[model samples]
Target: IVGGTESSWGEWPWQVSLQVKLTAQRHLCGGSLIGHQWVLTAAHCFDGLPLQDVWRIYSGILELSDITKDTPFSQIKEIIIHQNYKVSEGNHDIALIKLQAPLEYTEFQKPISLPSKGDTSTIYTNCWVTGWGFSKEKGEIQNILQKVNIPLVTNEECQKRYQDYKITQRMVCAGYKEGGKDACKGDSGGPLVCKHNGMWRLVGITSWGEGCARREQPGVYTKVAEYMDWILEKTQSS
Candidate 1:
């Protein structure tokens, strides 16, 4: 998380670390526990590393340094990438993970509810993003989870800022035009949650960005509300 602060333990229960190493914690990206045995993250994280089974979903923890033999985790049972996902374009940059075993509910672990379908109109909505990204784009990865509150940027404003890139309705942009307080590298696949009527809803999935909190370049996320159907279609069955 760039321009953010360390989050308290178990503050974001659904937040998880998507690791690659078996014996050690090699956090490659972030993930959200959407169900007892399901995880959601960006598809790009597995682009050149297609060994899905090797991935481990470490949940019920905040600090990466706190991981231990007793930490709750599950191996990937199956990997499902959105059919419309395009690697280069970052369109539909979402993926679902089916865990080999279930992660039961606990004070330190629970699933975040998905956003209602077609629940757009989130411009300027109050939201928060959590991750273990580097403080800077090309800096050291963080050990503790950091969170930052960012304003929801309108698609029109985002398109104007990113003149060269296409700002699809399926994407969500959040941050200030002046830069700072944005998700950076290693933050992809994390949660971008917004509050609605005092209830927290998963709004976006950290997808891509021009850079780390650069002027006019806020962090772009996969609008979760737009993929409600796709998510259910892909993960509804056992």
Candidate 2:
């Protein structure tokens, strides 16, 4: 009931993590762990949304393991949604959240490696998408993080696929051509990592798509390489 059985995803490494919950009945989108004290998520997830109401974060989790026993939850100390978030153009959709304290890295808790500048074209070949998102449309979001192996589609192909969705250079497309396999609702802000030189580098952040695992409508991700400097600058300033 997690990721599709047909897809190829690695086990949880604790490097990348998300802050979300089902009990609160609020969908705050997905997030990526950038540092021991910082996480990157979509601006829309927190924009116009009350910080008090949004559920905190759960990290160092793989399966729906015991939350009280192993998973560590943190109260959001501060949120920094991009000020340039454009309502019309979907520009600057990224945001950052600072935790009250730093998380200790373990087998189930580790930070995903960040990509370097000018690495926009680094993503290629087979990569993976992991999430607790809906596997199919009109379906419930899975409880356990699901994963899938997908090839990075070319920018030309991405534009062709999302002609109506406005695929810009700021965004990158991934996943397969056939339907019923891809990142979906609630998967936004999750990591799209590619293996490079024996290390896993985050290449994209789930941004938008037509639907969960649909045909011709591949999942769109925020181009991470294009914003590496902005990320470093913003985080350092904090």
Candidate 3:
């Protein structure tokens, strides 16, 4: 479902849409491909109250039909929430859910690469984020995922914009300060990718936000660079 030519965020097959079904009645949340059999997502997406609720992940899916009818659902074998992650401050909000089995890759279900430890510094300031979350406040989540191009903002800029919110080393800030772009609710756990070495590397995982794509309320992401070692350790063990 990618469109547009001559754009860095143009259509790519490795890009995948995920379905995270929280409960029987609630609609699923979106995520992106990260590895052969693993997915990175916001801890809160599965961290229910008491921090022990079970959540199911469905891969190789784009639409509701694809998830519910086409793809086989996988029970999360393990959920590794960052030990240092604080729900209040929102640091280390990232988590990796190990799939019960390795996913079979297809044209639409290929894995995206992880950003190198310092790929962000060399990735320049502009990148794109894709999701199926809400577009505006009080808006419904999009049935189809969408992508938005955004400029990276430094910690100083983030601090100035969100003085009241904690912008930690584990987090990254990006989006428009004048309200044109942002990631809203239901977008958590999706990828913020950048083109590197002619491939799309996931540099960030969508986390928390103050508002729906608001000015200065740019989506804060889980800094993938900072979690490389942690992700490696967890995946290796799993």
Q: How many clashes in each candidate?
A: 1, 4, 1
User: Can you rank all candidates by TM-score, best first?
Assistant: 1, 2, 3
TM-score of each: 0.94, 0.85, 0.84
Using lDDT as the measure, name the better of candidate 1 and candidate 2: 1
Q: Report the lDDT tens digits of candidate 1 across residue range 1-238.
A: 8889989867899999888876765888998999988999999988876887777688877788888777767899888999887777778899998899888988989899897786664443668999988888798789989999999888888888675567798898987878878999898999998876767889999988887988888788999989998888888764
For each candidate in the order shown, give its overall lDDT on alpha carbons.
Answer: 0.86, 0.69, 0.66
Which candidate should be chosen as best, given lDDT against the real structure? 1
- Candidate 3 lands at a TM-score of 0.84
Greater lDDT among 1 and 3 belongs to: 1
Ranking by lDDT: 1, 2, 3
Q: Decide which is better by lDDT, 2 or 3.
A: 2
lDDT of 2 at 36: 85
**What shift in Å separates residue 206 of candidate 1 from its native position after superposition?**
0.3
Which is the leading candidate under TM-score? 1
Over 1-238, each residue of candidate 3 has an lDDT whose tens digit, in order, gives: 0221121233544444444345442444556556767877777776555322345565544444335444566666667888887766677888777777877767656777776675455556677776667767667666555678887788777877676558877688887768667777776787777775666677778887776666766678888888898888888842
lDDT for position 199 in model 3:
66
